[PDB]
Amino acid sequence: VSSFKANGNIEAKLGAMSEKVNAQIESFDPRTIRELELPEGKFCTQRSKFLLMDAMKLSVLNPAHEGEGIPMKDAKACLDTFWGWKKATIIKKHEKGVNTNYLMIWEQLLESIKEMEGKFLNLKKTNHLKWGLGEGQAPEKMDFEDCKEVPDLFQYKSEPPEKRKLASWIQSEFNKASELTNSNWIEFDELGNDVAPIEHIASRRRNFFTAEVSQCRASEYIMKAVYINTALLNSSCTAMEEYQVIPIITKCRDTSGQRRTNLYGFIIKGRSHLRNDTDVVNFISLEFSLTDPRNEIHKWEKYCVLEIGDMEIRTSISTIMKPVYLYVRTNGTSKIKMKWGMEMRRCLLQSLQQVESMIEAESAVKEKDMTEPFFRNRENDWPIGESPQGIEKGTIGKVCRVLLAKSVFNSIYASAQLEGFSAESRKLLLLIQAFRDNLDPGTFDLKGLYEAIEECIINDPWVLLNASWFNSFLKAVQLSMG
């Protein structure tokens, strides 16, 4: 090594090497490339921990009784606004589950809520509830030497997920997540006094966001998830053995400026002796909803729905009575998942930073605070949706909510598939942008990337929707370009 002196060894040994070792550049063109192969099979299921568009609000105007601070006394006040309870009747079967238990759990819940007094409610350990929360379902741990020769002893099912097909419900969920409502869901904590001129402009600009965000339906889901998960983590640590009831609450303010407390349903917690972050607490989601499950049967594949009551609703013209459905579902969440559920409020920043950067991008070149002439001077000049006519453009306020909804749905439908897809699709997105910048782009192995992208797209509804959105973008480029 000390005595070595080079004699073109690289230059000689390069020529001796085979010509099959090479990095050939396949010139990239968006019009030449194909679309993403979406996976085929059964239709995809609603995997979220609570109901998004379909949920029903049993609301109460303003404070009442010693509740408000106390969680169950909010739910008691919310239940008293509805008087139309039938005897429970199963109308959509959870195909794999023993559906008699789901009816008994709701009846035991509604019985226990009536009979309870005080602040907290631990349900009694009954064999129908034990099934729903998975009592004793853990096999007992033993030494290998104690049970060597057992016939069916195998490792745990170390297999890939079952492939699913894209459905229309996930797109509609996003459409509805993007929309506005009459309730300001987000409430911000206090701030310091605005002394610096920039802090006044920042507040003025923050007020336009505050309106556009707080009124969005995505915020309703954020506040829901935050409450569910914050309450669930605190219960999971303190009440490890007890089957606690946790209501689904979101306190809001109307566009009039009046207070309101909405109730969506109940969550019965299971045993929460959580070793690692990934270890699960099984819970039973019981949620109110007006939508019929038999019209879109694939969406609710894991749910068991009960027709529990009836109520009056006033249409724009008519006044039509309808039945209420209680969507019951055995589910499970982990410390890591509910922890990130607690921190969902940061979804606003991903949107608002991106919106603010687009405002500040124009502000610099225009030499003026473009804050007000973006929101106030309404112009449809950002492509955010695709209708039967073509590609519809929207405003900075629409962009805010559209980008918020994505940020929320990324948090709700959080998975390895999304994580893997997002990283690899970005490379193709960057190639399209490098072509559209006119930088003569190229790839060493295009179809190898496609395989790495398509490997990720398996069963997650959100990943499947993003994968379709990528194709919708890809075609939308191709049509506009050539």
Partner RNA sequence: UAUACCUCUGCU
Partner RNA sequence: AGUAGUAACAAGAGG
Q: Are 33 and 446 in contact (CB under 8 A)?
A: yes
Stretch in the footprint of RNA (CB under 7 A) among 109-117, 146-154, 270-278, 339-347: 270-278
**372 touches another protein (CB under 8 A):** no
Q: How far is the CB of 142 from RNA (least distance, A)?
A: 7
H or E element in which residue 391 lies: strand 391-394
Of residues 240 and 297, the one with the C-beta less far from RNA:
240
Q: Are 105 and 123 in contact (CB under 8 A)?
A: no
Site for another protein (CB under 8 A): which residue of 25, 61, 290, 297? Answer: 25
Write the interaction track for another protein spanning residues 273-312; mark x where CB under 8 A is met and - where it is not. Answer: ----xx----------------------------------
Q: How far is the CB of 409 from another protein (least distance, A)?
A: 9
Residue 248 and residue 229: Cα distance in Å, rounded?
A: 10
Q: How far is the CB of 286 from another protein (least distance, A)?
A: 24
DSSP 180: B
Stretch in the footprint of another protein (CB under 8 A) among 109-117, 142-150, 256-264, 311-319: 142-150
**333 touches RNA (CB under 7 A):** yes
Q: How far is the CB of 98 from RNA (least distance, A)?
A: 7
Site for RNA (CB under 7 A): which residue of 271, 299, 401, 406? Answer: 271
Q: What 3-state DSSP class applies to 268?
A: strand
Site for another protein (CB under 8 A): which residue of 91, 323, 391, 478? Answer: 391
The alpha-helical segments, DSSP class H, found in 307-412 are 335-342, 347-366, 371-375, 396-412
**432 touches another protein (CB under 8 A):** yes
**6 touches another protein (CB under 8 A):** yes
**47 touches RNA (CB under 7 A):** yes
Site for RNA (CB under 7 A): which residue of 3, 7, 18, 155? Answer: 155
Give the one entry of another protein, RNA, none that residue 459 binds, where binding means its C-beta sits below a cut-off of 5 to 8 angstroms depending on kind.
RNA
Burial status of residue 11 (CB atoms within 10 A of its CB: 0-12, 13-18, 19 or more): exposed
Contacts with RNA in 422-461 (CB under 7 A)?
459
**33 touches another protein (CB under 8 A):** no
Token output for 306: 């009960």
H or E element in which residue 424 lies: helix 416-436
Report long-range pairs for 229-235 (Cβ below 8 Å, ≥24 apart): 229/333, 229/337, 229/338, 229/339, 229/341, 229/342, 229/344, 230/341, 230/342, 231/71, 232/267, 232/269, 232/281, 232/283, 232/333, 232/338, 233/335, 233/338, 233/339, 233/342, 235/269, 235/272
Q: Are 474 and 425 in contact (CB under 8 A)?
A: no
**383 touches RNA (CB under 7 A):** no
| Residues within the interface to RNA (CB under 7 A) | 47, 94, 96-97, 131-141, 155-162, 237, 240, 271, 273-280, 282, 302, 330-334, 337, 415-416, 459
